[PDB]
Design a protein around this ligand. Structure first.
Ligand code: YAT
Ligand code: MG
Ligand code: MG
Ligand code: MG
Ligand code: MG
Ligand code: MG
Ligand code: ZN
Lengths: 139, 224, 96
RNA sequence: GGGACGGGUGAAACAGGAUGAUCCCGCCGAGACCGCCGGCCGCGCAGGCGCCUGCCAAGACCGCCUCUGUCAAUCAAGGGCGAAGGCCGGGGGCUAGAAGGCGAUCAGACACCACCGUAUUCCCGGCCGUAAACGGUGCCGCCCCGCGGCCGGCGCGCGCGU
């Protein structure tokens, strides 16, 4: 990469991006964007690193994906990131999966500085009807 | 059916992003963009972008007072290889909102439409909670209806009087400070107990098509 | 016969109450009969809170919390050990 | 923008993806809904009742040296209201979802689990008149151990606290 294809360097601060974590019950997504969300620097998923469907949201796959992503973004010239941790939401579980914490620790142990952290789960002030019926999943 | 493509980051270049003069740290950061080709022009594509910035990073210090407020800015004009922004809206964080709530208390939420002298029309949202008297025998802290209506009326009056009509820069300064919250509380505290009183967020509904004099006004230190 | 004086719910001075959905099976339950707990937890598990704080650049930053309310049905609370089947004399105890 | 999977499950397989999906952001459209506060709180004859603002009529309770003077209680016949589903005639069409279709599981599975989906669910006018319509306890009236909590109104006392 030519120097103009990387962020400029200045002593006042460092290169700051924001990472979006999707800690779902069936998959994990690790996504890096600019300060706005209109550009994308690196995107990895847990299903690229396992052969078993039931292991896609596992922590191990999340860590492997995170290491690959930090490699890419470091090559692209990013050093610090903000965090946006998110669950499925939308009249759903509203509880994080097991890959989120693994992703966070993988970022921390990859020599990446941390800024701010916040919940981004989409929650409503009103509810459309969810699936299952009034007797629920009976099994 | 898969194919490989060349790396798109070999034809990129970054721009800096700048904040208004109401704040100390005016370097938001940098944004990438693709070099102009055909009709695509970077100075046009990056024209309207929205950046969410925490108030504690715009004003270093006062972390315990500024860490739970975050407004976002929008670029209006690209010049000198750098992007200029103005106010677009304000909000608090989710954890603070969740922390505000407690069982046994009452919650009041109010919104009013507030126009400006510059042609912006804004909708604001105000939240309040009741508290416990110092020597209250009972555990619950609910109140009667007349008190509730007095509190709503006082909120409307205070909001009208302090924000009835004001320019964007003055409003931004007031929001950066917390004087509107202070007025809301001391007016309400005169009626009853007030656990918390603040502004949840500010939305912009309509603005004029051209804001050039306003942008030139917001982005210089001395005029304000 | 009758097992509980409350008939398994907290319904006083009313005829009907609004319904809720169990968060596990999505069963419809009356609001007065559903089991409710409030939890407060850290976004980052406490094992790596120190690591995150060390990596944090800001000064004096505090770890945000999660504030959620969990609502479960009778069958799911028992299966997940949220409540326990008690003795005839211990059914009257109301303290936690 | 970016480039290879994604969805879903106990585990899987049907539907989606180089015509660029999943993911990030911004705008647009339509129709439902009213969250955390929310409760041995409350209102209503019962059925039932929760966004902002405004309008209309109503109701029980307390306080009173205001008025009338038995005007009352309960009830065949008769009249009115009455969850959800359902029906007729008009509107609307987003979620879910009887019927139907399809993938799994099983000896079989036309069921439970997964996915798609019509009537219905929403509004107006009108029928039907049923529910574990339950406090499984009819309405009016008198006496009655002790302790405690909450809601509304009124009065007493003081060192003035809801
Ligand atoms: C309703 C679908 C049934 C289909 N199968 C048969 C094979 C099987 C094997 C399992 O071993 C790993 C298994 O573990 C969860 C589940 C199944 C399902 C069982 C399903 C029957 C269903 N009702 C009876 C008991 C039961 C217990 C269950 O354990 C939680 C279960 O998982 C969702 C489903 C069922
Ligand atoms: Mg079961
Ligand atoms: Mg029995
Ligand atoms: Mg009932
Ligand atoms: Mg109906
Ligand atoms: Mg009966
Ligand atoms: Zn549940």
């Amino acid at each position: 990469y030519a120097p103009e294809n990387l962020p400029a360097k200045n002593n006042n601060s460092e290169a700051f991006a924001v990472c979006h974590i999707y800690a779902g019950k069936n998959d994990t997504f690790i996504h890096v964007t600019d300060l706005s969300g209109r550009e994308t620097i690196g995107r990895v998923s847990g299903g690229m690193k396992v052969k078993r469907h039931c292991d896609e949201p596992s922590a191990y796959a999340a860590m492997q994906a995170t290491q690959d992503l930090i490699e890419i973004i470091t090559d692209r010239g990013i050093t610090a990131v903000h965090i946006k941790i998110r669950a499925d939401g939308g009249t759903g579980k509203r509880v994080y999966g097991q890959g989120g914490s693994a992703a966070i620790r993988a970022l921390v142990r990859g020599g990446i500085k941390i800024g701010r952290i916040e919940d981004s789960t989409p929650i409503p002030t009103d509810r459309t009807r969810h699936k299952g019926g009034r007797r629920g999943r009976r099994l | 059916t898969q194919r490989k493509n060349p790396d798109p980051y070999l034809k990129k270049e970054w721009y800096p992003v700048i904040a208004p003069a109401h704040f100390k740290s005016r370097h938001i950061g940098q944004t990438p963009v693709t070099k102009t080709a055909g009709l695509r022009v970077a100075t046009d594509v990056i024209n309207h972008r929205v950046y969410e910035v925490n108030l504690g990073d715009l004003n270093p210090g006062a972390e315990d007072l500024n860490g739970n407020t975050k407004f976002y800015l929008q670029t209006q004009l690209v010049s000198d290889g750098k992007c200029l922004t103005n106010f677009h809206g304000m909000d608090i964080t989710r954890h603070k909102y969740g922390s505000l709530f407690r069982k046994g208390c009452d919650c009041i939420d109010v919104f009013m439409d507030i126009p400006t002298t510059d042609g912006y029309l804004l909708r604001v949202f105000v939240i309040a909670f009741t508290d416990r008297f110092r020597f209250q025998r009972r555990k619950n802290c609910h109140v009667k209806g007349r008190v509730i209506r007095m509190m709503r009326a006082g909120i409307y009056e205070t909001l009208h009087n302090e924000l009835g009509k004001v320019s964007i820069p003055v409003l931004v300064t007031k929001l950066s400070n917390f004087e509107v919250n202070a007025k809301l509380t001391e007016a309400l505290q005169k009626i009853t107990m007030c656990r918390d009183v603040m502004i949840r967020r500010v939305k912009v509904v309509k603005r004029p098509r051209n804001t050039m004099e306003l942008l030139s006004t917001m982005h210089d230190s001395n005029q304000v | 016969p009758v097992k509980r004086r409350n008939n398994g719910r907290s319904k006083y001075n009313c005829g009907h109450t609004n319904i809720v959905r169990c968060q596990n099976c999505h069963r419809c339950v009356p609001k007065d009969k559903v089991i409710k707990r409030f939890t407060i937890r850290n976004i980052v598990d406490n094992t790596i809170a120190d690591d995150v704080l060390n990596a944090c650049v800001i000064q004096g930053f505090a770890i945000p919390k999660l504030y959620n309310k969990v609502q479960y049905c009778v069958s799911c609370s028992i299966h997940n050990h949220i409540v326990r089947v008690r003795s005839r004399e211990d059914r009257k105890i109301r303290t936690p």
